[PDB]
Coordinates of C-alpha atoms and ligand atoms in Angstrom, one line a residue:
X3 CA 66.2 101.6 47.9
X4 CA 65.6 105.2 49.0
X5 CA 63.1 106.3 46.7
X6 CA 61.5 103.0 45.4
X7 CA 58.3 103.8 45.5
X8 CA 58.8 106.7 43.5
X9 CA 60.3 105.5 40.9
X10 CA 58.7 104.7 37.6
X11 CA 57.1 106.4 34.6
X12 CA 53.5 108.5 35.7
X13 CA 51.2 110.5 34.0
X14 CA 49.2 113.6 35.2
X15 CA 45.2 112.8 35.7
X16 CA 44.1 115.5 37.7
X17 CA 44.8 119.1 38.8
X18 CA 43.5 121.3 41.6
X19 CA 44.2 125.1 41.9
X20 CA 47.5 125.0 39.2
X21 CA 46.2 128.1 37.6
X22 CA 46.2 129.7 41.1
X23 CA 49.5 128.2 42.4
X24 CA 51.1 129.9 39.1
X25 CA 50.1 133.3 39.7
X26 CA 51.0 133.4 43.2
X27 CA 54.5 132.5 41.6
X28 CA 54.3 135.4 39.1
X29 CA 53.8 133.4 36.1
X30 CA 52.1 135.7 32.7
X31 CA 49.0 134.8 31.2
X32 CA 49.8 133.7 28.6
X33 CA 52.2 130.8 29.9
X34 CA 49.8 130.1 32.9
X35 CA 47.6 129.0 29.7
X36 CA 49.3 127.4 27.3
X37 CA 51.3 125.4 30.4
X38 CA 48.0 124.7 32.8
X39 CA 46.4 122.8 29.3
X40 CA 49.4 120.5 30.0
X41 CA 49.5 116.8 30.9
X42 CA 52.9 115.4 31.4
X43 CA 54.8 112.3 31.9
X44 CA 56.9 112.6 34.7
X45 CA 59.7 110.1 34.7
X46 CA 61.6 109.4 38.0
X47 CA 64.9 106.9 37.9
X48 CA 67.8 106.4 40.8
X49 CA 71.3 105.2 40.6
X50 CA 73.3 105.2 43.6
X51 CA 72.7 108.1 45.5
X52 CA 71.7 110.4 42.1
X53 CA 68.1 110.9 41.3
X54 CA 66.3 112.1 38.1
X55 CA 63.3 113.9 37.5
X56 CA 62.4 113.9 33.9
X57 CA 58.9 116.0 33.0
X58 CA 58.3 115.4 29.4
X59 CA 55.0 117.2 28.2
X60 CA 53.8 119.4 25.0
X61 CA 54.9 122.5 26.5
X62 CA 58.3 121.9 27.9
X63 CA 60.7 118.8 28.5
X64 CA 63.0 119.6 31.5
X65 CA 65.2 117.0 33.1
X66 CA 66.2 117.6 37.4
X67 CA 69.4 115.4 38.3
X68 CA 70.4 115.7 42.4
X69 CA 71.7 114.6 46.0
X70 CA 69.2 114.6 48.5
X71 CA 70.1 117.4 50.6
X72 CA 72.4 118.9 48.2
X73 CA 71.9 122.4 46.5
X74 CA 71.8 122.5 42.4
X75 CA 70.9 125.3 40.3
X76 CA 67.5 124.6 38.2
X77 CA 65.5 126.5 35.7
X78 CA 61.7 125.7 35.8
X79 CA 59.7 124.9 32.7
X80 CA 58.1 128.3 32.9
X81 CA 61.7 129.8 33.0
X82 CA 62.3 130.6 36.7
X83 CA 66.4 130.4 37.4
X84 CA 66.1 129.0 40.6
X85 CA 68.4 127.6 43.6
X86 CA 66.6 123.9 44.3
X87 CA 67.4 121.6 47.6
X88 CA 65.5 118.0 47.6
X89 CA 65.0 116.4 50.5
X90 CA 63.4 113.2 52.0
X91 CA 61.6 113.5 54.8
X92 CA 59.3 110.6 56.5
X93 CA 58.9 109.4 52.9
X94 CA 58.0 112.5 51.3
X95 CA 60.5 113.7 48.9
X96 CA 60.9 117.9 49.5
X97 CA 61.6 120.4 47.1
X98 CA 62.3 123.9 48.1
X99 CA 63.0 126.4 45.0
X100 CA 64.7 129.9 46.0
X101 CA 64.5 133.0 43.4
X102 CA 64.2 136.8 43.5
X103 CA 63.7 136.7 47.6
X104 CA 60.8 134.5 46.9
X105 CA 60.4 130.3 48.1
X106 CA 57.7 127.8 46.8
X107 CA 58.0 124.2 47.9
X108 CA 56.7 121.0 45.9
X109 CA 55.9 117.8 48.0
X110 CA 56.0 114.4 46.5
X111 CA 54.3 111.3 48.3
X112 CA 52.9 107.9 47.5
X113 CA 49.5 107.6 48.4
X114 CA 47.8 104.2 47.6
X115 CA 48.9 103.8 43.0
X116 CA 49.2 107.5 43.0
X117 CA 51.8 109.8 43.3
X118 CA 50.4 112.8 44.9
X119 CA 51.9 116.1 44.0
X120 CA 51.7 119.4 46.6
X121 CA 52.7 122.9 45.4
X122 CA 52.7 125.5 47.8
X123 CA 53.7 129.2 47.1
X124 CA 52.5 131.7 50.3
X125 CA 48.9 130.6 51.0
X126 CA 47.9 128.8 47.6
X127 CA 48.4 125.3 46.7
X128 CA 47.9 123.1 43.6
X129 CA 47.4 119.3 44.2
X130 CA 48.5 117.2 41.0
X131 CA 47.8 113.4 40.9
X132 CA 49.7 111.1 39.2
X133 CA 49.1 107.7 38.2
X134 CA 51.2 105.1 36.3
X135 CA 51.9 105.5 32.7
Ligands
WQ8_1 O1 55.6 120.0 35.6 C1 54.4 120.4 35.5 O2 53.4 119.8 36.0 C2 54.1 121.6 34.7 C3 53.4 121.3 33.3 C4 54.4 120.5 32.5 C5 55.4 121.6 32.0 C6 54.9 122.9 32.8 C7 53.3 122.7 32.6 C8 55.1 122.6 34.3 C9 55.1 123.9 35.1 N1 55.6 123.9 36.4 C10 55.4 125.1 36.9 C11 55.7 125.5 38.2 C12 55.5 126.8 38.7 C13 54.9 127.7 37.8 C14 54.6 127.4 36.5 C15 54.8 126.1 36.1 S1 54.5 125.4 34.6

């Protein structure tokens, strides 16, 4: 029951800052557009201990399976080959994503219907809301 709340089938509704986040990542023009016109479906699912994190959108479908606590390799939808570790802590699940020397970490939390996205590379972050599909 780790992850309840989490689980289910949510659609984006609002960004803050994305375009921002992305270039403090190192993300081209041209994918910071095409990607920050996007709107996806993020899908979340749990048996036993293994989650998923399906993102299904026009610009990419990518597909996360993991351990909480438990390194697995990853490559982002704007094509980033990264080392990911997913954690829970006090009911926020915590992403850390490691590449090229750099780190940008990607909170997840329940707030009230929503699920409340935080992406934070150096001093920039994005807030994405989700509600249910
Ligand atoms: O999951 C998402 O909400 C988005 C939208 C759906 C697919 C793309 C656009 C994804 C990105 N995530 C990142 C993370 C860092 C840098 C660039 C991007 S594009």
């Amino acid at each position: 029951h780790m992850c309840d709340a989490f689980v289910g089938t949510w659609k984006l509704v609002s960004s803050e800052n994305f375009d921002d986040y992305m270039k403090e990542v190192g993300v081209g023009f041209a994918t910071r557009k095409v990607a920050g016109m996007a709107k996806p479906n993020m899908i979340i699912s749990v048996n036993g201990d293994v989650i998923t994190i399906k993102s299904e959108s026009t610009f990419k479908n990518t597909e996360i399976s993991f351990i909480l606590g438990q390194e697995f390799d990853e490559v982002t939808a704007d094509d980033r080959k990264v080392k990911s570790t997913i954690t829970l802590d006090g009911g926020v699940l915590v992403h850390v994503q490691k590449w090229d020397g750099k780190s940008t970490t990607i909170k997840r939390k329940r707030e009230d219907d929503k699920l409340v996205v935080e992406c934070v590379m150096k001093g920039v972050t994005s807030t994405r809301v989700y509600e249910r599909a």
